[PDB]
Structures are given as structure tokens and as C-alpha cells.
């Protein structure tokens, strides 16, 4: 089971819980202050959405009290998910260069140490051949 | 020229089609919206320029339904492209950094080759040595 | 019941390349050592390279060195001697013998049992 | 890597006659000489393998001796069919083992 996309994939489910806590509590507290257009949900919608990324236009935002702090949780997430979705191509990317590592150190790694290996049968075929020298030339 | 171009200049040109999927679709379903001069497409060109960078100016924007939705598409692409020239830069200086590692590996190996199998020329070395100790001291 | 099969000697223009398998028959060539003896034509006794399966090695005679390569594989049982810039004093009769290796008391009979060999004819 | 001297090229004698064939070492082997009997056509025959007892199966007229460096096949009452060529080898040296002289070719005289 990816466990990138249970990452990936559910950091940007909950970014959306920012833009429907952006777009739903910041354009409630939006209806009735001196300059009130962020009023309607719907039409308060592209409000989370400029938030968020930070675009900024202009033609929905808040100027109340309780209206700005359930805002600044949005261009908060905006930047999370940004930096997710970053984790998650360097997630491929990198189990990519992950292919290459695995594949470059168990070959150098293998080959080495058969490497050492041939050297030790270096020695057994002298120890062997010594042995031959030995016992069976004195009986 | 490897998959860096076909990864880098494959995504911005995927970046190009949420460009002209935001002057485009926006721009359209802002033809009669109460308030629209996203309503000519030469005209609401400077509006997927301030979505995607996120600038947000605000001389050109819907108040439409699915004028909306066919724009926080764009300021999405904005973000991509953002991770990718950061893919592209990351793919040169590593690629310098994999090419440091060609140099090191080289010479931690070529140490590790010569000066190594070096000793499996005195293990014969002192194993000629007993087996003339033997037979040059004996028969 | 053991016994040993050269086979692939033939004929070769000056230079050329060839590879003769000494297929054996009675034991594993795990546990031998495979030699590869060529007697020119009517001229005498000659020994080429010889290997050692099991320890990992091989050793070739001081007249072949950059143009000769026995190696053998063990999965099927044979060993090869390769040849590969052939000059044209090369011609001969190929055997291929084996001698118990390093192990008990066996190594000390020789080249126990050689092949009938087969023949190489390098000339233009 | 070991050199090898055998003696002599060919020889001449009758049958039932004593004929012995040194081989001399240009360095120390201790007693992995071999002799081999080849007749004409076929490979070669094991005789002689620590240069001391021979092979199993061979007519117990072939004897091996040794002088540290110099080995010596001798066969005691020739027979016949011993007319062939033989080959004094080595199998001492680190080269590989194998190392064979000039051989000695043993026609005979009538």
C-alpha cells in the first residue's frame, strides 16, 4: 500500500478542510461588518482559494475580528500542501536514484567482497597444496 | 537530455495547458457575470498570470460559478511549475554531485583494487617460502 | 565410467579463433583439475593451460599468454580451452587430461586419464 | 618456472634387455615426476607417479628412482610391446604442473 499517497494524498484532503473552513467561517463572521461583500458561501469561495496560494485579488476578504484569525489558518495550509506535494516527487524521484543506490552498492559490494572471496581460495588452494607437500611425502 | 527534459520541459508544457485552460474557460463563463472584463480573452490574459505566480492584482477576475473552478485550477500549475524548476536545478548540481561521486568511487576503488590485491601477491609470496623451506631444507 | 572427449579441433586460417571442450565422463569436473596437452605434429609432447574448477583458478603455459583462455562451466561438465590469434605454429593434437586436485593423496597420480584429443590445423 | 632434461632421445636394444632413462630437473621438484609411455597414434600411458610406485595397472617391469633432481625409469626384462616413446613429467611447479622433457623413443634392434 503507498503510504506517499496516505501522505500526499491525504495532507491535500485536509488542506481542503482549510478552504472549507475558510470560505465557511470567515464569510459568515463576513455578513454585517462595514464592507461586507464576503457574506454569501458561494460566492465567497474564490476567498480560501487566493488565501491559500496567496494569489490575493481582492474582490472577497473580511475585515472583522474573528473573521482574520479564521483566515490566516488558510494561507497557512496553502504553504503545507505545497511542500507536500514536494515530498511526494521526491518520493518517485528519489525511488528512482533509490533503484540506482540499491542497484550500484550491491553490485560493487558483491563483487568486492568475492573479490576478498578469491583471495581466500588463493589461500586455500596453497594450504591444500602445502598439505600435499607435507605428510604425504614423508609417508 | 535524459529524463530531466522529458520530466522538466513535459510538465511546463503541462503548465501551458492550465494557462490556456484559465484565460480560456474563466474567461468565457465571464461574458455576462455582474461585473466582467474577464469577459474578452486578449483582455483576461493578465488574469491566469496573477493566479498561477499568485500575484493577484485584481483588474481582471469571475464572480461566475464554474468560472471558479476553472481557475484554482490554474493557480495549482503555478505551484508545480515551482517544484519543477526546482526538480530541473536539482538535476544539474546533483548531477555535478553524482560526478564528484564518480571521482571518489574511482579512487577509493583503484586504492582498494591494487594496493589490495597487492597482498594476495605476498600470500603466495610467504606460502613459497615454506613450501622451499620444506623441500629445499629436506629432498 | 570415466573417460574424457576433446572435441571442436579443425581448421583455421593464420590468426583465427577456435574452442575445443574436453567433455568429461566419470566424474564431476567440480573436483578435478582439467589440463589441456597438445603435441604438435610429430614433434613432442606439449602442455597448454590447465584449470582448476575447484579453487577458482587456471594457469597457461609461458608459450600462450594474451591468445589462449581455458575456463569451464560446471553446470553442464566440460572445460574449454579457447584460442583465439592462432599462429600458425599452433597445429596439433589437442588432449586434455586430468589430475586429481589438491586433496587427499590424489593429487600426487598426475594426469590420471587423457582424452584421445582432437586436431587443430592453423595454415592459410 | 621448472625446466626438464630427459636421456636420451631415442635408444636402441633387443627384448628382454635392461633399459633405464634418466631425466634431470633444473630445480627442485621433490617427487612430482611422472612417466608416460606413448605409442604411436593414441595418447599417452601412466607408469610412474610419485616418481617412486606406479600406476594401477602397469607391467612390473617399470621401476622409478630418484636422485633429489635426477629420475630414472628403468625396465628390467623388456618385453615386446614396450616399444614406444616415453615422457619423464613434472608436477611440482607452481607454473601449473604439468612440464614434460624431450622424450625418449625406444625402437628396437634386430
Known amino acids: 500500500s503507498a503510504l506517499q499517497w496516505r501522505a500526499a494524498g491525504a495532507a491535500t484532503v485536509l488542506l481542503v478542510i482549510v478552504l472549507l473552513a475558510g470560505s465557511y467561517l470567515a464569510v459568515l463572521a463576513e455578513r454585517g461588518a462595514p464592507g461586507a461583500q464576503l457574506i454569501t458561501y458561494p460566492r465567497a469561495l474564490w476567498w480560501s482559494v487566493e488565501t491559500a496560494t496567496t494569489v490575493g485579488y481582492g474582490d472577497l476578504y473580511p475585515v472583522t475580528l474573528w473573521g482574520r484569525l479564521v483566515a490566516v489558518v488558510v494561507m497557512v495550509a496553502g504553504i503545507t500542501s505545497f511542500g507536500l506535494v514536494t515530498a511526494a516527487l521526491a518520493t518517485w524521484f528519489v525511488g528512482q536514484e533509490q533503484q540506482q543506490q540499491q542497484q550500484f552498492v550491491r553490485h560493487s559490494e558483491k563483487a568486492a567482497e568475492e573479490a576478498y572471496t578469491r583471495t581466500t581460495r588463493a589461500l586455500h588452494e596453497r594450504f591444500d597444496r602445502l598439505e600435499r607437500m607435507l605428510d604425504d611425502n614423508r609417508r | 537530455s535524459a529524463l530531466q527534459w522529458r520530466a522538466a520541459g513535459a510538465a511546463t508544457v503541462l503548465l501551458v495547458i492550465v494557462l490556456l485552460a484559465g484565460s480560456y474557460l474563466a474567461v468565457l463563463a465571464e461574458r455576462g457575470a455582474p461585473g466582467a472584463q474577464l469577459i474578452t480573452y486578449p483582455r483576461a490574459l493578465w488574469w491566469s498570470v496573477e493566479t498561477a505566480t499568485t500575484v493577484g492584482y485584481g483588474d481582471l477576475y469571475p464572480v461566475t460559478l464554474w468560472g471558479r473552478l476553472v481557475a484554482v485550477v490554474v493557480m495549482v500549475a503555478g505551484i508545480t511549475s515551482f517544484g519543477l524548476v526546482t526538480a530541473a536545478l536539482a538535476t544539474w548540481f546533483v548531477g555535478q554531485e553524482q560526478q564528484q561521486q564518480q571521482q571518489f568511487v574511482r579512487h577509493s576503488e583503484k586504492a582498494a583494487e591494487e594496493a589490495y590485491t597487492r597482498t594476495t601477491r605476498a600470500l603466495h609470496e610467504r606460502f613459497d617460502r615454506l613450501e622451499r623451506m620444506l623441500d629445499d631444507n629436506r629432498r | 565410467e570415466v573417460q574424457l572427449v576433446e572435441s571442436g579441433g579443425g581448421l583455421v586460417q593464420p590468426g583465427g579463433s577456435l574452442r575445443l571442450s574436453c567433455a568429461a565422463s566419470?566424474?564431476?569436473?567440480?573436483?578435478?583439475?582439467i589440463h589441456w596437452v597438445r603435441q604438435a605434429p610429430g614433434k613432442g609432447l606439449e602442455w597448454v593451460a590447465s584449470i582448476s574448477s575447484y579453487y577458482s583458478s587456471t594457469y597457461y603455459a609461458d608459450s600462450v599468454k594474451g591468445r589462449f583462455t581455458i575456463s569451464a562451466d560446471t553446470s553442464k561438465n566440460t572445460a574449454y580451452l579457447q584460442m583465439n590469434s592462432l599462429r600458425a605454429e599452433d597445429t596439433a593434437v589437442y588432449y586434455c587430461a586430468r589430475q586429481p586436485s589438491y586433496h587427499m593423496y590424489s593429487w600426487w597420480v598426475a594426469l590420471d586419464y587423457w582424452g584421445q584429443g582432437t586436431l587443430v590445423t592453423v595454415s592459410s | 618456472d621448472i625446466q626438464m632434461t630427459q636421456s636420451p632421445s631415442s635408444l636402441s636394444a633387443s627384448v628382454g634387455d635392461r633399459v633405464t632413462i634418466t631425466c634431470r630437473a633444473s630445480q627442485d621438484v621433490n617427487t612430482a615426476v611422472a612417466w608416460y609411455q606413448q605409442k604411436p597414434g593414441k595418447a599417452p600411458k601412466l607408469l610412474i607417479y610419485?616418481?617412486?610406485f606406479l600406476e594401477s595397472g602397469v607391467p612390473s617391469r617399470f621401476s622409478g628412482s630418484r636422485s633429489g633432481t635426477d629420475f630414472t625409469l628403468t625396465i628390467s626384462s623388456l618385453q615386446p610391446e614396450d616399444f614406444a616413446t616415453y615422457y619423464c613429467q613434472q608436477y611440482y611447479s607452481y607454473s601449473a604442473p604439468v612440464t614434460f622433457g624431450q622424450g625418449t623413443k625406444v625402437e628396437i634392434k634386430r
Open positions: 610419485s616418481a617412486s
Open positions: 566419470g566424474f564431476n569436473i567440480s573436483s578435478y583439475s
